[PDB]
Coordinates of C-alpha atoms and ligand atoms in Angstrom, one line a residue:
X1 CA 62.2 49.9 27.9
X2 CA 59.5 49.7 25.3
X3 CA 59.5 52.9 24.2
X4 CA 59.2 54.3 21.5
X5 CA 61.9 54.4 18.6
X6 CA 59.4 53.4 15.7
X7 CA 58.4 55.8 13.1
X8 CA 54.6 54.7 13.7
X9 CA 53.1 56.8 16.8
X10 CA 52.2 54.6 20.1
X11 CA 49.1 54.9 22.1
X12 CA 48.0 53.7 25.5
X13 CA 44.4 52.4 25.1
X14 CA 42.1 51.3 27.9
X15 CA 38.8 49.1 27.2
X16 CA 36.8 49.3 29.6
X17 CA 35.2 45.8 30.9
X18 CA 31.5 45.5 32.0
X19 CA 30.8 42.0 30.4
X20 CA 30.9 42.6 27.1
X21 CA 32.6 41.2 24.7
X22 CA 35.9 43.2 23.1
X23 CA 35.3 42.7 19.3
X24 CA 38.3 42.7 17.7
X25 CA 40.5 39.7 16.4
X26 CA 44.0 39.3 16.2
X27 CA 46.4 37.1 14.1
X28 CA 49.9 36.7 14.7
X29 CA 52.3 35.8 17.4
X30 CA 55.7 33.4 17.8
X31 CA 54.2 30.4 16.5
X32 CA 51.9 32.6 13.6
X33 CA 52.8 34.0 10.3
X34 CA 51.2 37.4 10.0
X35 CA 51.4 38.3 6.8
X36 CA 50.7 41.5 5.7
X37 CA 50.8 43.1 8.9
X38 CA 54.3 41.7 10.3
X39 CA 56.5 41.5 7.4
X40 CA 59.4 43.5 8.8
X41 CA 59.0 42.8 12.6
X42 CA 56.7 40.3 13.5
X43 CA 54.3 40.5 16.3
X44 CA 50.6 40.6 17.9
X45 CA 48.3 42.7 15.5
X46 CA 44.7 43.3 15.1
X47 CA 43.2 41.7 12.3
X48 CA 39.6 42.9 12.6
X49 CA 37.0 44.9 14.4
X50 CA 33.8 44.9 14.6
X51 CA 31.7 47.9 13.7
X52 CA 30.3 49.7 16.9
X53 CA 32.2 47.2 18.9
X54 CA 34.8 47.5 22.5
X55 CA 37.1 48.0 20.7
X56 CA 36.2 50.1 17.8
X57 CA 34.6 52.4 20.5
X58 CA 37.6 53.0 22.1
X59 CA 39.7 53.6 19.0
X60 CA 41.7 49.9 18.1
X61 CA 42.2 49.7 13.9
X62 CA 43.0 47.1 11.9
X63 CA 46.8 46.6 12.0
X64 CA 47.7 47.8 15.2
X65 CA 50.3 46.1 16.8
X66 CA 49.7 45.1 20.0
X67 CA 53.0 45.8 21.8
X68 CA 52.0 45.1 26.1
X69 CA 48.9 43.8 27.5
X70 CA 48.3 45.0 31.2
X71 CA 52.0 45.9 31.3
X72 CA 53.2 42.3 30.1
X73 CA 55.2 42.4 27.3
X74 CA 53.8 40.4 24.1
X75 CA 56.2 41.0 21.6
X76 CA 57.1 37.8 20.8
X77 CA 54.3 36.1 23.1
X78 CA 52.6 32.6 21.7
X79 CA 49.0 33.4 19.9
X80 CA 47.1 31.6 22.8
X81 CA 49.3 33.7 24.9
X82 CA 48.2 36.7 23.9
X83 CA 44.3 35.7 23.6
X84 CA 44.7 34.7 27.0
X85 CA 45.7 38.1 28.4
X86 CA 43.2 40.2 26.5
X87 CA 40.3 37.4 28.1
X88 CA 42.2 37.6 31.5
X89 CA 39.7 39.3 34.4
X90 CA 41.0 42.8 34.8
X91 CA 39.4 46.2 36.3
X92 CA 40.5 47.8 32.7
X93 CA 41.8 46.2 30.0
X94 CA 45.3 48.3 29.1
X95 CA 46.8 47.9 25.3
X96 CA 50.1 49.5 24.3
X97 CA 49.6 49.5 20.8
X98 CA 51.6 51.1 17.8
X99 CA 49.8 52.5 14.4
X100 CA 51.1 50.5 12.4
X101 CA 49.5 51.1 8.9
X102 CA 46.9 48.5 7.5
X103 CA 47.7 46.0 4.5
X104 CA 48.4 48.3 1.2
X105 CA 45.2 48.1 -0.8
X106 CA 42.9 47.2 1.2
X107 CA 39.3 46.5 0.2
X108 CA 36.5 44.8 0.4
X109 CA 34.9 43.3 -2.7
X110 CA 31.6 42.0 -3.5
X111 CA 31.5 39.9 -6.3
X112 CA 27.8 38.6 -7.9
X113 CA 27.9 34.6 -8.5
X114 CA 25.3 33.9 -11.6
X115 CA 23.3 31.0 -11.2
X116 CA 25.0 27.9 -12.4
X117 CA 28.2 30.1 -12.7
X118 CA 31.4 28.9 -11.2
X119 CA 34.1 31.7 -9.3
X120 CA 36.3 31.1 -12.2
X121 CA 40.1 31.8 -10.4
X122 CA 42.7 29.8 -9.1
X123 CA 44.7 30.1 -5.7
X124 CA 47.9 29.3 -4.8
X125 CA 49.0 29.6 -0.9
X126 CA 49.2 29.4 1.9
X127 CA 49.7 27.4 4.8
X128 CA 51.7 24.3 5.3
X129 CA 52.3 24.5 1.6
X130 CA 54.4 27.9 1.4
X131 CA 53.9 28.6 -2.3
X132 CA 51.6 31.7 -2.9
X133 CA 54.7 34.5 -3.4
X134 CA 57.1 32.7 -4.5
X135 CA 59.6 35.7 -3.8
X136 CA 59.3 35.6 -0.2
X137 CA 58.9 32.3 0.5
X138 CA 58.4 32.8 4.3
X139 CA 54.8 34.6 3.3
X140 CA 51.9 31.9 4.3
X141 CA 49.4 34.2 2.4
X142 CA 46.9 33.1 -0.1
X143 CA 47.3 34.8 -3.6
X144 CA 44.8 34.8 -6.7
X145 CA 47.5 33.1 -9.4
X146 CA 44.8 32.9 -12.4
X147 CA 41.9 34.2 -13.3
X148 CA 39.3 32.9 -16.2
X149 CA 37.6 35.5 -18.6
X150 CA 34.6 32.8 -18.3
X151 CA 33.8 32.9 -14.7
X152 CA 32.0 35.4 -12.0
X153 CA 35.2 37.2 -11.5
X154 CA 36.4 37.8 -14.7
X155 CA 32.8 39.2 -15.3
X156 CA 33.6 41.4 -12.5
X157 CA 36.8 42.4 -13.4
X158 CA 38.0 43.9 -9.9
X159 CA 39.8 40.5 -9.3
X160 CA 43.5 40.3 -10.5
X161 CA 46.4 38.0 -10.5
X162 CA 48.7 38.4 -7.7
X163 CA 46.1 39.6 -5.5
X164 CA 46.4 38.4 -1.6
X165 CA 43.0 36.7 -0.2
X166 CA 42.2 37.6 3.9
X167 CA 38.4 36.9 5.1
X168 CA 35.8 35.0 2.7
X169 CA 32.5 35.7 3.9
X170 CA 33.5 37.4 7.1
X171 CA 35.9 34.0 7.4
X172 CA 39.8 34.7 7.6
X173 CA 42.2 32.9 5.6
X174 CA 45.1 33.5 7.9
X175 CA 46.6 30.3 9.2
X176 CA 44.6 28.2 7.1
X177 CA 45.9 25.6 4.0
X178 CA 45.1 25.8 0.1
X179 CA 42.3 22.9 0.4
X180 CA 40.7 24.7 3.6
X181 CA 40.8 28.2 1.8
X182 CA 39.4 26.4 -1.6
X183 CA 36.6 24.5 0.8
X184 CA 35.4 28.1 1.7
X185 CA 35.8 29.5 -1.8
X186 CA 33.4 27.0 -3.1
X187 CA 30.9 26.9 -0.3
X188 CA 29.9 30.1 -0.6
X189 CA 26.4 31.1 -2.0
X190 CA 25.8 33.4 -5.1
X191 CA 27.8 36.5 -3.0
X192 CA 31.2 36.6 -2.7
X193 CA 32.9 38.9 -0.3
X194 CA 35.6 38.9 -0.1
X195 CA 38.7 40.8 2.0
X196 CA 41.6 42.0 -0.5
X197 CA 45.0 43.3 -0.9
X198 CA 47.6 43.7 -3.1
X199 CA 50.3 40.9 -3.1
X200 CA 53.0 40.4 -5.9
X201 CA 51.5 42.6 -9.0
Ligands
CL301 CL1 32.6 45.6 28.5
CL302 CL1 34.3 42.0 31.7
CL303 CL1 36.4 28.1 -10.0

C-alpha cells in the first residue's frame, strides 16, 4: 500500500513543469549500489541539487528517497527506469519521497594544491573492484586509505584515512572504478573540492 511504516516522515512533492530543467540528480536503483544513502534498504535517492534549482524550490534534499514517481512504484525500478519517469511529459511532476537523512558527515572541502605540489593520498574503492571497506564488502564506495604528511592534504589536515570520496569537482564518484576516480583526482587544477563523508574511522 506504500504507506508509511518507516520512522523517516513521507511527503508528496509536485514540481511543477514549464520547460525547465528539474536540477537534482539521483544515484541508485536495482542495478546501482548507492552507498551511503541505501545501506539498509536500497532504492532511488537524490544525490544532488542544485542551488535555486526545480527542485530545490520546491523542497527535494539530498538523500531523499524517491519512493513513486506519478503514482508508479520505483522501489526497486532500474536507474534508467527511474530517469525515465522523472523526464517523462507530465502536467506535474508527482514524487513520493521519504526524509531519509543525508550521508553522516557530510561536507564539502576545499583543499589548496601548491604549485608543483602533488594531492598526496591514496584511494582504495570502488567500483568493479569492491575493496574500499573491507567490512562490508557489498559497499562500491571510494575511501581515502593513506594519506602523506608531504602532500596538499596533509598540509591541510581536514583529510583523514577512512574517509568516503562522492563528487570531485562537482563530478560524482558513484558508480565509477579506482582508475576513473584517480583520472579525476589528478586532473584537477590547484583546487580541490571535494564532497566528503565519513566511512570506516
Ligand atoms: Cl519547469
Ligand atoms: Cl516541462
Ligand atoms: Cl598523490
Amino acid at each position: 500500500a506504500a504507506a508509511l511504516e518507516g520512522p523517516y516522515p513521507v511527503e508528496e512533492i509536485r514540481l511543477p513543469r514549464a520547460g525547465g530543467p528539474l536540477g537534482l540528480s539521483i544515484v541508485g536503483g536495482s542495478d546501482h549500489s548507492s552507498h551511503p544513502f541505501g545501506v539498509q534498504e536500497p532504492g532511488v535517492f537524490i544525490s544532488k541539487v542544485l542551488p535555486r534549482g526545480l527542485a530545490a524550490r520546491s523542497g527535494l534534499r539530498v538523500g531523499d528517497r524517491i519512493l513513486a514517481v506519478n503514482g508508479q512504484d520505483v522501489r526497486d525500478a532500474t536507474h534508467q527506469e527511474a530517469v525515465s519517469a522523472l523526464l517523462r511529459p507530465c502536467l506535474e511532476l508527482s514524487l513520493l519521497v521519504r526524509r531519509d537523512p543525508a550521508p553522516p558527515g557530510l561536507r564539502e572541502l576545499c583543499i589548496q594544491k601548491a604549485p608543483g605540489e602533488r594531492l598526496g593520498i591514496s584511494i582504495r574503492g570502488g567500483a568493479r573492484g569492491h575493496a574500499g571497506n573491507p567490512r562490508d564488502p557489498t559497499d562500491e564506495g571510494i575511501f581515502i586509505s593513506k594519506v602523506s604528511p608531504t602532500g596538499a592534504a596533509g598540509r591541510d589536515g581536514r583529510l583523514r584515512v577512512g574517509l568516503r570520496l562522492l563528487e570531485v569537482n562537482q563530478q560524482s564518484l558513484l558508480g565509477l572504478t579506482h582508475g576513473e576516480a584517480v583520472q579525476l583526482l589528478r586532473s584537477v587544477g590547484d583546487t580541490l573540492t571535494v564532497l566528503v563523508c565519513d566511512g570506516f574511522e
